[PDB]
């Protein structure tokens, strides 16, 4: 019985190898008292968020990279003990990592699992490669968009091409900020503690990507047909109009956010273009979308349209965006950690004791 953990910048996803979905999905948040010692330590996840009024809240993962190891240990401790309810000394553990995870970080993660958690075996896998596998491919380009950052990761015959990886510094957090702003300008005011959560939910429930953005802007200016009602926690109903598709439009037009960067369609094109000419047909034919911020209705049609426009007129373009593609990384890990060949892939405790943390660069790539 192996465990799979996908440590997102925003959400941690955890479960049991062999399951088709994570057993636990919780905010990647550690909460500590502001004023030590005067009132009756730490909190993780929803509880941190509930008691945020009296806590300093920290996010140990930024852009996929761990920036605080004591907080990271709290997240894993909460994962094993409160979420999965396991003794971690009894389970091989598969963990995920960001593209360009620093060497020191992969070593530290390995050392923590073996030394603090006493895992009998562990393995670190790259997130984009796990999404590709979950889609039943060994070659393709993954557009992974979650919390703080989007990445385009060309993968050929099972392995990422590091020279061709690009990043757009816009993801879900930016899209929530931007939904707040445009709804505020419309005339609404999000003032309570639950402001972020309300706007986030409006985004997740009602945003879609427009196939043709100016046609949609026009449809919305001249008709009520695009508009939706949204009931606030207090019972007030507000109307959501063009904000629905203007919000995720910022993925394709980062200028909406006062950014120089190219959109996700162009980042993707540019990544394909950094790759051997011979393999590009296979990248364009296997554009895999994954992460929470790829969950907008319309996004796959829009990617197809935008890539069609950029690629030679005869390129076969295929976008792969299945409904579960929010947990594609986790599901790829569940599959990988279940294989009969995985017992020979992992770092055992015995190997760790013999080689120490640097074993990770020789076993996991």
């Amino acid at each position: 019985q192996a465990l799979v953990i996908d440590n997102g910048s925003g959400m941690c996803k955890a479960g049991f190898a062999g399951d088709d979905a994570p057993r636990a999905v919780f905010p990647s948040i550690v909460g500590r008292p502001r004023h030590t010692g005067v009132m009756v330590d730490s909190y993780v996840g929803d509880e941190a968020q509930s008691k945020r009024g009296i806590l300093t809240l920290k996010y140990p993962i930024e852009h996929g990279i761990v920036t605080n190891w004591d907080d990271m240990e709290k997240i894993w401790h909460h994962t094993f003990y409160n979420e999965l309810r396991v003794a971690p000394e009894e389970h091989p553990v598969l963990l995920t990592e960001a593209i360009l995870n620093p060497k020191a970080n992969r070593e530290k993660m390995t050392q923590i699992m073996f030394e603090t958690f006493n895992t009998p075996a562990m393995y670190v896998a790259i997130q984009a490669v796990l999404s590709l596998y979950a889609s039943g491919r060994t070659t393709g380009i993954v557009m992974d968009s979650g919390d703080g950052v989007s990445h385009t990761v060309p993968i050929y015959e099972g392995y990422a091409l590091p020279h061709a990886i690009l990043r757009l510094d816009l993801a879900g957090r930016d899209l929530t900020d931007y939904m707040m702003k445009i709804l505020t300008e419309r005339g609404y005011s999000f003032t309570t503690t639950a402001a972020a959560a309300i706007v986030r939910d409006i985004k997740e429930k009602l945003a879609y990507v427009a196939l043709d953005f100016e046609a949609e802007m026009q449809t919305a200016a001249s008709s009520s047909a695009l508009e939706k009602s949204y009931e606030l926690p207090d019972g007030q109903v507000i109307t959501i109009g063009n904000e629905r598709f203007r919000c995720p439009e910022a993925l394709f037009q980062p200028s909406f956010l006062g950014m120089e960067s190219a959109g996700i369609h162009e980042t993707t094109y540019n990544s394909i273009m950094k790759c051997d000419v011979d393999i590009r047909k296979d990248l364009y034919g296997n554009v895999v979308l994954s992460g929470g911020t790829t969950m907008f209705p319309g996004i796959a049609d829009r990617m197809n349209k935008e890539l069609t426009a950029l690629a030679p007129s005869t390129m076969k373009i295929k976008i792969i965006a299945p409904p579960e593609r929010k947990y594609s990384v986790w599901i790829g890990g569940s599959i990988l950690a279940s294989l009969s060949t995985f017992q020979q892939m992992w770092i055992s405790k015995e190997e760790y004791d013999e080689s120490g943390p640097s074993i990770v660069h020789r076993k996991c790539f």
């Binding site: 062999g18 399951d19 088709d20 590709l132 596998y133 979950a134 889609s135 039943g136 491919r137 060994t138 070659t139 015959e157 099972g158 392995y159 599901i331 790829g332 569940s334 599959i335 990988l336 279940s338 294989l339 009969s340 060949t341 020979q344």
Partner: protein
Amino acid sequence: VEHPEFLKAGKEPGLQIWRVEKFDLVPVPTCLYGDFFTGDAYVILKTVQLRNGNLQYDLHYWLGNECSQDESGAAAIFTVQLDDYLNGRAVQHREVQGFESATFLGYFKSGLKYKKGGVASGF
């Protein structure tokens, strides 16, 4: 990978076929080569010998219309693992029911056949 099936792979010219069965690579009986369960995923290795008599490897994973995600995912990953095992020398090919390459269809001398059903998902 100490996978007993990997030890048997790519030894002499010809054709080997495995089926993904609950997260393992199980050999297909040679008498059933070419009859594909559309509910399953398969790994196929074609070993050709050139005129100079050097070995050549093409590795096809075949995805049935109704194979579950664990099956198609395992077939992808097994393909990569087998390729690494064969020192990176196999060209990998994704083959989808109804859309196989002529090369792959060529492997089967009386034409490949589809049939419904197969082994259940390992999830």
